[PDB]
């Protein structure tokens, strides 16, 4: 059903002699041109919505001192992550999608895949680290401990280490970056069993270390937090404000957990199917179904984690309305 070569895999059979290198000729045989136009349109959407919302976060952080607290660093980190998702991934894929194929060759594939994977992993591990920080600060699990600047910096560096420990192996021999789906964007190889780079062990290490571990850490930390808040509000039913707080905190934890699942579950499940029923017939459009949900997390992660944060909100309505409110 496919068509392989030295540094790619076109999910389209060369029985008709039409398949060409995704680095060299347009792939209008695995998708009409208008579908490449819609690919470019969606990239345009993700840039027009994703760049303002994420850059503005860093901006208002520069304007408002009450935002430059350590328990906010990871949020800033998230914004930077999304910008790596925007300029390392979304814009490149816009340009290449407008040509019908990946014009920047194998090296450009390694770059666009390295920065797209990097940004996405920084975002994910920032979500995990944030959950850990809120568990520690709110649940008070260690005797005589308060959260300082050095702890926050440590957390950000941990996100960077977990990201590099997930984006660098394909550049040096563990798995590899190849054009995915409609061959216009580059990603981690999990649809060929390429033994020379040991794709199977890397895909297992992804699913276990960079999916199961974060999932468990988030669910644990936020379950513990909702327990703590529920329990305190139970011991304080005379305080209506504590009741409000219990409600809002529960609703937010549900929103964040469900958003995490919507974001990373399709990628894990579809990729795991392409690595459990591997080798079959996979429409490029079928291949771009989890990447949709994951890539849109550069837009709704700032909406959930920043725009729904009363501090950041306030400072943004202040900045955009250039003075008051």
């Amino acid at each position: 059903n496919g068509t392989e070569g030295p540094n790619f895999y076109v999910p389209f059979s060369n029985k008709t002699g039409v398949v060409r290198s995704p680095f060299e000729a347009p792939q209008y045989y695995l998708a009409e041109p208008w579908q490449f136009s819609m690919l470019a349109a969606y990239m345009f959407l993700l840039i027009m919505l994703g760049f303002p919302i994420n850059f503005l976060t860093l901006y208002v952080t520069v304007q408002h001192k009450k935002l430059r607290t350590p328990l906010n660093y990871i949020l800033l980190n998230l914004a930077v992550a999304d910008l790596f998702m925007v300029f390392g991934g979304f814009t490149t894929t816009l340009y290449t999608s407008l040509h019908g194929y990946f014009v920047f060759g194998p090296t450009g594939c390694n770059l666009e895949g390295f920065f797209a994977t990097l940004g996405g992993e920084i975002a994910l591990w920032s979500l995990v680290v944030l959950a850990i920080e809120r568990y520690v600060v709110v649940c008070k699990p260690m005797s005589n401990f308060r959260f300082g600047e050095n702890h926050a910096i440590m957390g950000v560096a941990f996100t960077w280490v977990m990201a590099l420990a997930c984006a660098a192996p394909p550049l040096v021999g563990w798995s590899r970056y190849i054009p995915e789906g409609m061959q216009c964007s580059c990603g981690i190889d999990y649809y060929t069993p390429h033994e020379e780079t040991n794709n199977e062990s890397f895909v297992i290490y992804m699913f276990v270390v960079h999916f199961i571990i974060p999932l468990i850490v988030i669910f644990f930390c936020y379950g513990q937090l909702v327990f703590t808040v529920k329990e305190a509000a139970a011991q304080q039913q005379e305080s209506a404000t504590t009741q409000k707080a219990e409600k809002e905190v529960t609703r937010m934890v549900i929103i964040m957990v469900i958003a995490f699942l919507i974001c990373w579950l399709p990628y894990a499940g579809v990729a795991f199917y392409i690595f459990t029923h591997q080798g079959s017939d996979f429409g490029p459009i079928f291949m771009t179904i989890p990447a949709f949900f994951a890539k849109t997390s550069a837009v709704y992660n700032p909406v959930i984690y920043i725009m729904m944060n009363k501090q950041f909100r306030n400072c943004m309505v202040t900045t955009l309305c250039c003075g008051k409110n």
Binding site: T69, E133, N309, F312
Partner: peptide, 11 residues
């Protein structure tokens, strides 16, 4: 924990 909730931006 209302103070902690505001610190972490959850309330």
């Amino acid at each position: 924990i209302l103070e902690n909730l505001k610190d972490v931006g959850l309330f």
